Amino acid sequence: MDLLKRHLAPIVPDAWSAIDEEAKEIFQGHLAGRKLVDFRGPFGWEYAAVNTGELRPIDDTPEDVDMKLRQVQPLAEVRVPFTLDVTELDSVARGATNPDLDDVARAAERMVEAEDSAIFHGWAQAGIKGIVDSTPHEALAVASVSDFPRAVLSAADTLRKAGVTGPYALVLGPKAYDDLFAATQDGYPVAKQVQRLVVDGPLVRANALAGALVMSMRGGDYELTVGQDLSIGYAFHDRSKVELFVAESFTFRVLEPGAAVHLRYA
Amino acid sequence: MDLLKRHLAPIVPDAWSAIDEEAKEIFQGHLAGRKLVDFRGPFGWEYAAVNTGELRPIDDTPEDVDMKLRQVQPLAEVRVPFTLDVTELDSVARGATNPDLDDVARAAERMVEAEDSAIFHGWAQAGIKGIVDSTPHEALAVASVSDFPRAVLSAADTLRKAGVTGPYALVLGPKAYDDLFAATQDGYPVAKQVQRLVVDGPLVRANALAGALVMSMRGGDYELTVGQDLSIGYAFHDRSKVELFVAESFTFRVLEPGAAVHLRYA
Amino acid sequence: MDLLKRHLAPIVPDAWSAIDEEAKEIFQGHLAGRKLVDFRGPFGWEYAAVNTGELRPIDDTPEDVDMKLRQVQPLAEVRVPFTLDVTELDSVARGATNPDLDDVARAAERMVEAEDSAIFHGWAQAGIKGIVDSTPHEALAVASVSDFPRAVLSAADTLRKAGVTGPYALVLGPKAYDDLFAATQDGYPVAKQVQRLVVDGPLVRANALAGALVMSMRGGDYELTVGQDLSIGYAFHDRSKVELFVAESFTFRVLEPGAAVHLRYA
Amino acid sequence: MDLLKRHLAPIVPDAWSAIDEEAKEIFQGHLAGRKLVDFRGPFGWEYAAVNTGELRPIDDTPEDVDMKLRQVQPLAEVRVPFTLDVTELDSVARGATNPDLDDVARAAERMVEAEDSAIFHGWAQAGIKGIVDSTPHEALAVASVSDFPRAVLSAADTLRKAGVTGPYALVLGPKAYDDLFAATQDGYPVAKQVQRLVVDGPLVRANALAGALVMSMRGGDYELTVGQDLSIGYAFHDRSKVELFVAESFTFRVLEPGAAVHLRYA
Amino acid sequence: MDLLKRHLAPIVPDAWSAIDEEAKEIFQGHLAGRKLVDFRGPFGWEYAAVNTGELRPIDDTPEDVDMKLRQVQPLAEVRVPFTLDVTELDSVARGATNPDLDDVARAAERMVEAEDSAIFHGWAQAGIKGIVDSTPHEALAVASVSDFPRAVLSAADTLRKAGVTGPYALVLGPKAYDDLFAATQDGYPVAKQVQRLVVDGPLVRANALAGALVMSMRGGDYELTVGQDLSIGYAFHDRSKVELFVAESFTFRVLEPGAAVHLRYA
Amino acid sequence: GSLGIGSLR
Amino acid sequence: GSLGIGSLR
Amino acid sequence: GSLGIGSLR
Amino acid sequence: GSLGIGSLR
Amino acid sequence: GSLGIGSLR
């Protein structure tokens, strides 16, 4: 019996499989940050913090003693509750193939929002700095949907100016993806040109990213550490409802702040 | 001797082979629904209904008893009669290679009409709901043959808005197929653009579909269950004519109503 | 000693090889019908007729007797004479590599004309109906060289309207081939578009075809039966000239008249 | 000791290797005719003439005697002298990698000129008829650099009109190559179109060809026979200079005069 | 203990690995000359000079004696110092993944500048002649960013005029690369055209090249000899700083001066 | 004893 | 003893 | 006992 | 003892 | 004991 306590839930194994599949497909579809940054872990429930290898001096020390404190980045544990109907889960045992698992998708996208919002725009209460809020480069102000094929090159230029090599991925927020994929130049494709621009770089949709972003896929620049990977656990149940949660433990580090350029309002 | 009773027909084996080949090529050419939806079966002549796994409450029950009725979807059995000339079938035994099998093709396309009409536009007397009549999305009104390259994207957008991923197939009714494939932009192809639009999605012609349709090929959304697959059986014969039939047993279920968008008058 | 009687000719074996190669390359280059229709045989010199498997009633018969006559299609035997110089053939034995074999090519193209003219436009004295003269469809009147990319589609549409599936080959007469291959749209190719139009269908030149033609490559529609395949035989010789002939026995049947559409004056 | 007499030269083996490599790369780069026509040999120093297999009648003969003379085409032996500095060749033995071998390249291109001039424009003193001067077809007069994409097709048409099949190679003289490869249509390539025109036919530069030429690569039309292939021999040497030569023996025959069309002033 | 004296440095092995990786990635990213010219070596610390194989006469010699001096090209040894913080290197031992190695990159690009400046523009104090300053061809004056697609062809023409075959690489200085890669023709790519122009030739950025350059990749024209390849050595250290250096020994020879054409101000 | 059409994907 | 042309597909 | 998502590259 | 050029196709 | 760069072609 681990912390998920799944054997205590009034849920048949096939209903557990259905819940897990729903969450898994949502996560594989929507986790923007995980498909860009470098990935450490998972290390389990007792991994508490990432060792940075840095030391910080302590001022009030005697003359005969040199003392320094080791610097570490603690992980955040995130739990998103959701509820399911017990009868809907029971129907799986009678051969039902489409039980109502709406709240599973809701909780999974809430977890996706939490993780990607931390990765891109930081999370100050967790001591995390995002990719966007840590870049020293000036944010290109894109004026219209047709300025993107220019802007990216400019951003890419900046990346190779500062010394950041490697394929450059384009990350599009909600409006940017909508406007640049609902567009067509009288038959001639535009998004095809967009992928043609980036040298074997991926183009990814991030629902939590405001605006757009161009960032290196070189590696060693952005680091997501996961202690406990995305899991479904059981909390409680009444006669008719069962309370579950999505759980994860993670932290994110910006190793090289200059490997990305932000593109403002699409 | 099964229900087809073929050994009672005054038909030589090679004539049976010719009849079966004619029907088989018609069906492989024209069965639109079977090449889109998920397929269960065949299960044979005694498969009577699809278990949905749902329960429905019964109101007039005593206080000490909870009673529910299991919900099931019965299959429909469809038979399309046709007639053939006995002498034309006899000529096969003398080495004739092109016997008159026109009524075979007629009956086979009538069966195709029945099945595809049930799948796309429903069949209320059989308790079947079609793909088109069950979609909650608004039906895009296509104005002209050149609006299709736009409309599809719009529909596709809607599909990804509601949460329906996966490749999106385009299904064209008779007029839509005729007008969009009898078209050419001064040498530059249009239908090529149409297949280019859909991300590895098929483009299929449905003679029973009114208008056009964009629907996900993700799977798990639309379910055709077949008990007895398409068969040719013998009914009766006089001195000069033999009466045969095409037979099938099937039902169709819309598991996820939101996985398709209808495009109105082409 | 067969009917070709080649051992009686005053021709050395290498001269026979040269004659055969000349005829063979002409035939492989120019036989239009053989690369479109279905092929039966060869069956040799004693194959006399194709069994159709049909019966025809006989009117003047007694009441106690039913009599029918079997229907068959007799083959035609075609011989094209030509003459060669004996000294030119002797020079092959002295190491000459280019003997004068002009009349061989002349006779071979005459045989090609006979066969392809029978296949496409029929040969009433041989009881053969051609592809063009048996089609029930209306002949598209092509107005100019630029109307072909439209016309073909129209014809193709007709073919799929009547129920004829499969790849559709385009067959071009002499003028049509000349005008549509001596054409270029300011650098942009037109013939490339023509082959692009037909769905994996061949484009073939037929010197005996008047106009142009679009026909299905499905199979089972057009049937060329060959008894004795194209052969070179010896007839006679004087002191200085040797008389040879090209010989063939064949017949052609239109099994499905509706599988082709004629395009008139190019 | 063969006719090249190389062991008598005051040349170290590595200097011989360098001379041979220089000549070999020039010849592989510039021999236009050898990469088009059919090739017989090499047969060595004692091959004197090509047997044509033809006989020519002799007029003044007695009535009781028939006499004919065998026809043969004698080979021409070509020697191009050149001179090298002995000290430059000695420097190879001290590890020098770039000795002055300019006269080797000069003599090799002179030999290329002789051979290709014989092949394309004939050499009447050697009894050779060229490809260009033997063609019965009319020479297309190309007016401007943009007329080539048309002219070739015309020429190609002529080739298939007269009965000459097979891939058609384009051969460009100096000015034609310069003008048609120093050209670009505002970014869009022209030479790419030129190679696209010819059906898997090569496009070759011939420095000895005046104008341009379209000729069949079918085979059996043009025949270059080589007795002694291209060789470097020693003639004489003084204290400071060594005299070498390029040597070859060859003849060229036009078997089918109609397999090429000349394109005049580019 | 070699000349690098690395065992004397107060540096842990993993810090040495990090320093070497930083330098190695800079060098693989920026060494323009090494990816164009032919490469000899490395031969180690005691290789002192390249034997050219040439002799030079000496004037003041007696009549009975002929004396000549062997010609050789001595190598230059280049050392670029840099400094690192000892505590930053110590942090590697505590698990730090991003120590401050800025001066490593600075020194490595300084070495790249030295080597590439010698290769392209010569280094007279080292007795090296560059590719640009040794070419006899006239330097094409490029007027604007759109003149490059023309100019290259012109330069390429010159290269094939003088007799220099083989693929032709384009080498772009800083401004030329910036202007020709920050350019786009209203969606249509320009740099794609640039790589399309050169026949399987590479396009390389050289930070030390002024203007641009078109040069043959045939081989045997330009020769970089390396005695001691790029190495990191230790010089000295105080309590807080360690002094390291980048070291190399090399020379460059222009074997064929005519294999390149310079393009002036971009 | 059907025609064996089944699923057409 | 024909030329062996046969079908040309 | 996670869903086993891990890295998505 | 030639340069071995031969046919260039 | 170099960095092992060598030729970059």
Numbering used by the authors:
A (entry chain C), B (entry chain B), C (entry chain A), D (entry chain E), E (entry chain D): 1 to 266
F (entry chain 2), G (entry chain 1), H (entry chain 3), I (entry chain 5), J (entry chain 4): 117 to 125
What does the study report here?
Encapsulins are protein nanocompartments that house various cargo enzymes, including a family of decameric ferritin-like proteins. Cargo enzymes are directed inside the encapsulin nanocompartment by a terminal localization sequence (LS) that binds to the interior face of the encapsulin. EncFtn oxidizes iron in a similar manner to other ferritins, but due to its open structure, it must be associated with an encapsulin nanocage to act as an iron store. Here, we investigate the structure of the Enc:EncFtn nanocompartment from the halophilic bacterium Haliangium ochraceum to gain a better understanding of the arrangement and stoichiometry of the complex.
To capture the extreme open and closed conformations of the fivefold pores, we performed symmetry expansion on the I1 particle set in Relion3.1, followed by masked 3D classification without alignment centered on the vertex. To allow for the widening of the pore, the open pentamer protrudes from the nanocompartment by 5 Å. In addition, our focused refinements of the pentameric subunits allowed us to build and sequence the 117GSLGIGSLR125 peptide from the EncFtn protein.
